[PDB]
A paper describes a structure:
We isolated mitoribosomes from a cell line with knocked-out GTPBP5 and determined the single-particle cryo-EM structure of the purified mt-LSU assembly intermediates. This approach allows the capture and molecular structure determination of normally short-lived assembly intermediates that do not accumulate in large numbers under physiological conditions. Second, in the GTPBP5KO—but not in the GTPBP5IP—the junction between H89 and H90 of domain V is significantly different compared to the mature mitoribosome. Specifically, at the base of H89, one helical turn remains unfolded and instead forms a loop. In GTPBP5KO, but not in GTPBP5IP, the two N-terminal α-helices extend from MRM2 and insert into the rRNA core to thereby displace and retrieve the A-loop (16S mt-rRNA domain V) through a complex interaction network. This places the 2′-hydroxyl of U3039 close to the ideal methyl-acceptor position in the MRM2 active site. However, there is no density for either SAM or S-adenosyl homocysteine (SAH) in the MRM2 active site and there is no apparent density for a 2′-O-methyl on U3039. Importantly, the striking similarities between the GTPBP5KO and GTPBP5IP structures suggest that GTPBP5KO likely represents a true assembly stage, not an “off-pathway” intermediate accumulated due to the absence of GTPBP5.
Mitochondrial ribosomes (mitoribosomes) synthesize a critical set of proteins essential for oxidative phosphorylation. Mammalian mitoribosomes assemble in a multi-step process that includes the maturation of two ribosomal RNAs (rRNAs; 12S and 16S), a structural tRNA, and incorporation of 82 mitoribosomal proteins (MRPs). Here, we determine the cryo-EM structures of mitoribosomes isolated from human cell lines with either depleted or overexpressed mitoribosome assembly factor GTPBP5, allowing us to capture consecutive steps during mitoribosomal large subunit (mt-LSU) biogenesis. We purified mitoribosomes from a genetically engineered human cell line that lacks GTPBP5 (GTPBP5KO) and from a cell line expressing 3xFLAG-tagged GTPBP5 (GTPBP5IP), and used single-particle cryo-EM to determine their structures. Both the GTPBP5KO and GTPBP5IP mt-LSU assembly intermediates reveal several trapped assembly factors: the MTERF4-NSUN4 complex, MRM2, MTG1, and the MALSU1:L0R8F8:mt-ACP module.
Residue numbers in the entry:
A (entry chain t1): -15 to 30
B (entry chain k): 2 to 96
C (entry chain r): 35 to 41, 47 to 196
D (entry chain I): 67 to 196
E (entry chain J): 18 to 157
F (entry chain 4): 66 to 103
G (entry chain l): 93 to 136
H (entry chain N): 32 to 133, 148 to 251
The structure:
RNA sequence: CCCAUAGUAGGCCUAAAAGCAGCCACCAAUUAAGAAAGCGUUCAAGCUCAACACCCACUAAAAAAUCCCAAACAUAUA
């Protein structure tokens, strides 16, 4: 499997399918799940 | 390169090489760059300025040559051999 | 085929590159001519064959480009030289500058001419019978050619 | 002609193959740059400049480089390797300093490269430096 | 033009060796010789100093002074003032590997020496090769 | 020119051409190197 | 520096002695080849 | 692609690596030992046809006589272009012993004879140059040969004999007296098999 | 075709031989250059070659005296 990156200079920032799935999951998840995610992120880095 | 070394780059003041490295039809122009950016040819005069402007966006390979006089030499090396380009360049310099 | 055009801007353009006939009679032939069973079966006369391996201005094409057998390359080279001298290729005349118009020259019909006409010196003193200076006719490279007549090619006259 | 008897790779070929793999996997920042015909003095001093800023220079023959990448993830870098080439290798992406010292000599083109397991062009390089 | 010499620091005027070449180029030999005086007095005296001088068309003087030759350092280490004639089975002096490393440490600091390599193992390998070229053998 | 049964290139710039039905060595750098096949 | 102790002496490692698939191995073989070339080119 | 270099460390060089001086005339004259009827120039050599403590040589491909001049030519040319440490030369022909009176001494050489030999820590190509030079300056036809080249030559001759498509050979016809051919042939031709004609030798004849 | 940094002008003899007046050793850094194979310098300085990349192709003689001396011809079935 190849990266196949930089298809064109004017390409409107195409994204891989893998980066898209996590975005949808976060939106569907409730704030309570997000609240624990934010707290753990704060613990790792600030 | 040796032929170009003998025939100094006196009239020309600026040379510019533009190519797309991902494109398959640039190798010739690249070879041309390799020949023009050597001490044997560059040390003939310091008036000459060699510029390499490599771009990613899909465009035809081309080299630009600026002379001291009104002479102006553009050539697209998409379907031109490096040797042919060098010979044409030398002939133009001879004037 | 590639054409270079100068209008100062120089471009290269690819035109229709002719292609080989669909099925050669002898595949797994190394030469182009070896394939068409044309090894010893062509002479200086055979301009259809010879015109294929020459540049528009009459010069021979390189061996690597055409993929000719070395032996066969040499044969075609000399055959084309003979073809030119016999006047069988009128459309492959040298690139003369427009300014230069060739002066009128005495015309002599010739064929099977090995040497360039300028280079040869006249045989003023032909030898005795036992050691005779003979006038070369045709190329020794074409000695291996198929001979229908019982008498082989008389290469020296 | 009868099929040409295959010859076992000269040891050097095998050794050369290993070095490329090691230097490529270890170093995050790889930069494909055309190996221009500079003077020995000039080449040494620019190499020293790179060494000061912790950037290493490597060249590998295309004869061995091409087979390595023809069956790999990084097959998109094959057109980059035509004619003279060199690899600017670094553990960390220190692009700003190499860019600024390349600015001195315009004839040298930065063809492209790969940073953090993703390919990038010179335009992308300058975007990443900014 | 770049001219390489191992003129001794102590002797100010080169005289015969550099006389014809400088004359051919047509540069002031007096200025050139007096330039060496500062460099001589800055460091230890009575030691040869290899220099790689650069001559420009405008007749300006560029002085690039390199560290003393490896030959003299190895001779000093062995304590011999004269190298072996045979350079074969004749060993004029014995130098410990420790002292070889010490001289290698204090050697690789200049671009004239050109050994800018990060591992000093390469440098010491060069020195041990040079020692073998001389009538010097290593121990320990 | 000097007549030679065997022709030898005397320097790098020497070059060997067949003209008028015989071999010649020509040399632009060293004109003395000029040779004619006999 | 431990590697000070770990080094070659007197006799240079012979081509047979030096292991293949090594950088120095090919350096020695190249060196010998240049020697061969120089020896042969003596009369030419 | 790099290739392994042959080692000649085992090879030893004699104390005198140069060709010794050859005298113009023998100190004491000697009578004929060989039969008078025999020609010393005609036919194949029966002696010194094989390499002895040497790798390279000058092979004679024709009969002839060597004067003192030829010896001097050989000696000077070989010694001048020799590296004494690397390579050594030995004479494979005796000093001129056969007198010619109109008095100068000559040595006979038959075809197949090795005139001079050479060995040491060197390849064929190194020595071939000056050896070929000397071979050309010899009266008879001669060429520089290695062990390998001589063996190849002999194998090629053998191969040509075996390979020949011609039903008729000189040997076959001569031995059987097939056209009454012995009338125009020498008795020596039976042994020579048509390869030798006078002092001259044809290598191209089977 | 292309290209050539450097441990060092490798040590002894030599006014000095510094790669190439001579003798011994012939290691060694880069990725890759022989303590240098051929020229050239009083000695230096320099031009090549082998070296790395680039992938290109690379396959041997003649003359003389009244006036040359058959005519000629490569292509229809031994
Ligand atoms: Mg080379
Ligand atoms: Zn010449």
């Amino acid at each position: 499997e190849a990266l196949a990156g930089a298809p064109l200079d004017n390409a409107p920032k195409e994204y891989p399918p893998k980066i898209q799935q996590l975005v949808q999951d976060i939106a569907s998840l409730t704030l309570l799940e997000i609240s624990d995610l934010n707290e753990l992120l704060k613990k790792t880095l600030k | 390169a040796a032929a170009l070394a003998r025939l100094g780059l006196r009239p020309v003041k600026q040379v510019r090489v533009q190519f797309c490295p991902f494109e398959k039809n640039v190798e010739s122009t690249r070879t041309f760059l390799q020949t023009v950016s050597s001490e044997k040819v560059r040390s003939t005069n310091l008036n000459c300025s060699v510029i390499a402007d490599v771009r990613h966006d899909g465009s035809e390979p081309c080299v630009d040559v600026l002379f001291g006089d009104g002479h102006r030499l553009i050539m697209r090396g998409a379907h031109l051999t490096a040797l042919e380009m060098l010979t044409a360049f030398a002939s133009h310099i001879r004037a | 085929f590639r054409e270079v055009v100068e209008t100062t801007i120089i471009e290269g353009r690819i035109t229709a590159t002719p292609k080989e006939s669909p099925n050669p009679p002898n595949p797994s032939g190394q030469c182009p001519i070896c394939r068409w069973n044309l090894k010893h079966k062509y002479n200086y006369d055979d301009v259809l064959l010879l015109s294929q391996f020459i540049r528009p201005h009459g010069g021979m094409l390189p061996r690597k480009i055409t993929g000719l057998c070395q032996e066969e390359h040499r044969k075609i080279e000399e055959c084309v030289k003979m073809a030119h001298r016999a006047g069988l290729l009128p459309n492959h005349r040298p690139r003369l500058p427009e300014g230069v118009v060739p002066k009128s020259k005495p015309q002599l019909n010739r064929y099977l001419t090995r040497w360039a006409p300028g280079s040869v010196k006249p045989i003023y003193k032909k030898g005795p019978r036992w050691n005779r200076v003979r006038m070369p006719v045709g190329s020794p490279l074409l000695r291996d050619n198929v001979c229908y007549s019982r008498t082989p090619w008389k290469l020296y006259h | 002609s009868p099929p040409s008897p295959p010859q076992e790779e000269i040891g050097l070929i095998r050794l050369l193959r290993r070095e490329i793999a090691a230097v490529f996997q270890d170093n995050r920042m790889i930069a494909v740059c055309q190996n221009v015909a500079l003077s020995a003095e000039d080449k040494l001093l620019m190499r020293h400049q790179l060494r000061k800023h912790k950037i290493l220079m490597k060249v590998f023959p295309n004869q061995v480089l091409k087979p390595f990448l023809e069956d790999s993830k990084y097959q998109n870098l094959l057109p980059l390797f035509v004619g003279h080439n060199m690899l600017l290798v670094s553990e960390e992406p220190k692009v700003k300093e190499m860019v600024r010292i390349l600015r001195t000599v315009p004839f040298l083109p930065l063809l492209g490269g790969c940073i953090d397991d993703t390919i990038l062009s010179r335009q992308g390089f300058i975007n990443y430096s900014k | 033009g770049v001219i390489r010499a191992i003129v001794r620091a102590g002797l100010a005027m080169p005289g015969p060796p550099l006389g014809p070449v400088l004359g051919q180029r047509g540069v002031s030999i007096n200025q050139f010789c007096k330039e060496f005086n500062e460099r001589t007095k800055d460091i230890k005296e009575g030691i040869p100093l290899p220099t790689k001088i650069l001559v420009k068309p405008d007749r300006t003087f560029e002085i690039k002074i390199g560290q003393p030759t490896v030959s003299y350092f190895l001779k000093a280490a062995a304590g011999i003032e004269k190298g072996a004639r045979q350079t074969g089975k004749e060993v004029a002096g014995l130098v410990t590997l420790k002292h070889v490393y010490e001289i290698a440490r204090i050697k690789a600091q200049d671009e004239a020496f050109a050994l800018q390599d990060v591992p000093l193992s390469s440098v010491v390998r060069s020195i041990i090769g040079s020692a073998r070229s001389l009538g010097i053998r290593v121990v320990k | 020119f000097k007549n030679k049964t065997v022709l030898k290139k005397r320097c790098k710039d020497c070059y060997l051409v067949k003209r008028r039905g015989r071999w010649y060595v020509y040399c632009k750098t060293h004109p003395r190197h000029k040779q004619r096949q006999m | 520096p431990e590697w000070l102790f770990e080094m070659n002496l007197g006799p240079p490692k012979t081509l047979e002695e030096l292991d293949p698939e090594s950088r120095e191995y090919w350096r020695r073989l190249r060196k010998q080849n240049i020697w061969r070339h120089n020896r042969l080119s003596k009369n030419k | 692609t790099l290739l392994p270099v042959p080692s000649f460390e085992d090879v030893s060089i004699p104390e005198k690596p140069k060709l010794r001086f050859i005298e113009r005339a023998p100190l004491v004259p000697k009578v004929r030992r060989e039969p008078k009827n025999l020609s010393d120039i005609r036919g194949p050599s029966t002696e010194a046809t094989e390499f002895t403590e040497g790798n390279f040589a000058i092979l004679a491909l024709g009969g002839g006589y060597l004067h003192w001049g030829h010896f001097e030519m050989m000696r000077l040319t070989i010694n001048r272009s020799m590296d004494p440490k690397n390579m050594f030369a030995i004479w494979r022909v005796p000093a001129p012993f056969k007198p010619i009176t109109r008095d100068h001494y000559v040595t006979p050489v038959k075809a197949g004879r090795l005139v001079v030999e050479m060995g040491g820590r060197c390849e064929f190509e190194e020595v071939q140059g000056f050896l070929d030079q000397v071979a050309h300056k010899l009266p008879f036809a001669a060429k520089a040969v290695s062990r390998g080249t001589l063996e190849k030559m002999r194998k090629d001759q053998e191969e040509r004999e075996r390979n020949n498509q011609n039903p008729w050979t000189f040997e076959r016809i001569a031995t059987a007296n097939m056209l009454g051919i012995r009338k125009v042939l020498s008795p020596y031709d039976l042994t020579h098999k048509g390869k030798y004609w006078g002092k001259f030798y044809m290598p191209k004849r089977v």
